[PDB]
């Protein structure tokens, strides 16, 4: 449960400092240097006070190794709005910036600090015996991007053994970013980060842009509001190991009931019962419409039709704050009808997880006193349209051959791109063809594939 937190890239370091200061305001870590609730230095030693333990200097500092060869993100995590609450001396800067080029990181520009990050992970991996995996904050191409996550994952699978490799593989919106080459690294992701991992997640940026421009109506279509909402989703997922109690539905059975298969590796997220700062005027606190607008595309990160995507698993999660008996009271609300199209060889029921202790609210953003949540996270075959969109983008770019000579004279290979295409095709066909109900193998005589 003392999992090693890696944060590379500009998005990784950005949401790393943001989310760890959200833990600081969540666990009470005041800018004094220590909490006023529990007087143990740095951090506590409870079941949930376990992210913060003794590694640095006896002060139980927050535990996250921050490495990126882009030096300006290391500067603004060193010179942001908090100067001592992170690791006082363990953040090492990067000397030369990759500057939006992924392929330099895996072969040329990031190879000098691989020994240093191996030393850091050997420092932070011989620690306390609780280690259920890795809280990887993956990125594609912002800073170094997929380079350090890729080399860390491959040498962690061939050198550290078979530990779980929980990923936050962000698939950002091209509108808010500036790169164009991003399909190349997003499809090399399958070759270098997908097979040798063991568990993964998905965070997105298109739906937050869509609600911020149209629905939530916040005039901030940049990475800052994306960080402000992904901080909420990271706090929501870490509340399992952060809010221990009677209903501590933690990571232990979570990693079991997420993924069924090798290449059913990619879950989905549908957290959006959000109430805005311009909606923060004592409005309706709803437990009905947050159940009634689940399969509508508002909560979905990628606009997909639920009418075509069959589900082999479904993990329901309603984290509130009001009553532990409201678990039963919300069981007896809407779950009785639920005629949802399923694979003919999967279960039907919905798991339940609540955290009835109320949290501490993040100030200075676009959120009200949020207390309750809905998230229908599962592995769905309805992301086949999103991966077909990505493959259409990559097929058009490979017909255009943009930055091919940029991405071949450093260590890559056209046959390596062919094998990456085959890996992407395997991840497709485990969701396109095998992922749908394959009942057409029993027997009939019409002229089919015998």
């Amino acid at each position: 449960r003392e999992c090693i937190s890696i944060h590379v890239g500009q998005a990784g370091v950005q949401i790393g400092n943001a989310c760890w200061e959200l833990y600081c305001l969540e666990h009470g870590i005041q800018p004094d240097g220590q909490m006023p609730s529990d007087k143990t230095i740095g951090g506590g030693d409870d079941s949930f006070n376990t992210f913060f333990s003794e590694t640095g200097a006896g002060k139980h500092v927050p535990r996250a190794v921050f490495v990126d060869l882009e030096p300006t993100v290391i500067d603004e995590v060193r010179t942001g709005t908090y100067r001592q609450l992170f690791h006082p001396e363990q953040l090492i800067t990067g000397k030369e910036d990759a500057a939006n080029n992924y392929a330099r990181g895996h072969y040329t520009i990031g190879k000098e600090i691989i020994d240093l990050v191996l030393d850091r992970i050997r420092k932070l991996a011989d620690q306390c015996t609780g280690l259920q995996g890795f809280s990887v904050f993956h990125s594609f191409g912002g800073g170094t991007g997929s380079g350090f996550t890729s080399l860390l994952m491959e040498r962690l699978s061939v050198d550290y053994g078979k530990k779980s490799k929980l990923e936050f593989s962000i698939y950002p919106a091209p509108q808010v970013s500036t790169a164009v080459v991003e399909p190349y690294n997003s499809i090399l992701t399958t070759h270098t980060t997908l097979e040798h991992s063991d568990c993964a997640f998905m965070v997105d940026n298109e739906a937050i842009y869509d609600i911020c421009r149209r629905n939530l109506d916040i005039e901030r279509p940049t990475y800052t509001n994306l960080n402000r909402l992904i901080g909420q989703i990271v706090s929501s997922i870490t509340a399992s190991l952060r809010f221990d109690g009677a209903l501590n539905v933690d990571l232990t059975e979570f990693q079991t009931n997420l993924v069924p298969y090798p290449r059913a590796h990619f879950p989905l997220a549908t957290y959006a019962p959000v109430i805005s700062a311009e909606k923060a005027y004592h409005e309706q606190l709803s437990v009905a419409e947050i159940t009634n607008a689940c399969f509508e595309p508002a909560n979905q990160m990628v606009k997909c039709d639920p009418r075509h995507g069959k589900y082999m698993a479904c993990c329901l999660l309603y984290r509130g704050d009001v009553v532990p008996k409201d678990v039963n009271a919300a069981i007896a609300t809407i779950k009785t009808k639920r005629t949802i199209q399923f694979v003919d060889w999967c279960p039907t029921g919905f798991k339940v997880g609540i955290n009835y202790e109320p949290p501490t609210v993040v100030p200075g953003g676009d959120l009200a006193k949020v207390q309750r949540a809905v998230c229908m996270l599962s592995n769905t075959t309805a992301i086949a349209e999103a991966w077909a969109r990505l493959d259409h983008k990559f097929d058009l770019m490979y017909a255009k051959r943009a930055f091919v000579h940029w991405y071949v004279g450093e260590g890559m290979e056209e046959g390596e791109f062919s094998e990456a295409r085959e890996d992407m095709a395997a991840l497709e066909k485990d969701y396109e063809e095998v992922g749908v109900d394959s009942v057409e193998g029993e027997g009939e005589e019409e002229g089919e594939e015998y």
């Binding site: 009942v439 029993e442 027997g443 009939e444």
Partner: protein, 55 residues
Amino acid sequence: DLLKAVRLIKFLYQSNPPPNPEGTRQARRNRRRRWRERQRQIHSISERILSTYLG
């Protein structure tokens, strides 16, 4: 005598497959209707014509 008769046994009574219990009710119903027409048209008209063949 035996030619059309015995070779018609050797074909037609070698032309009866077991049904398919795997599959949903629609294809099973189609195989059932083809079965209940197949054995009726194998026994009825063939032993009618082997009855009134020449006596």
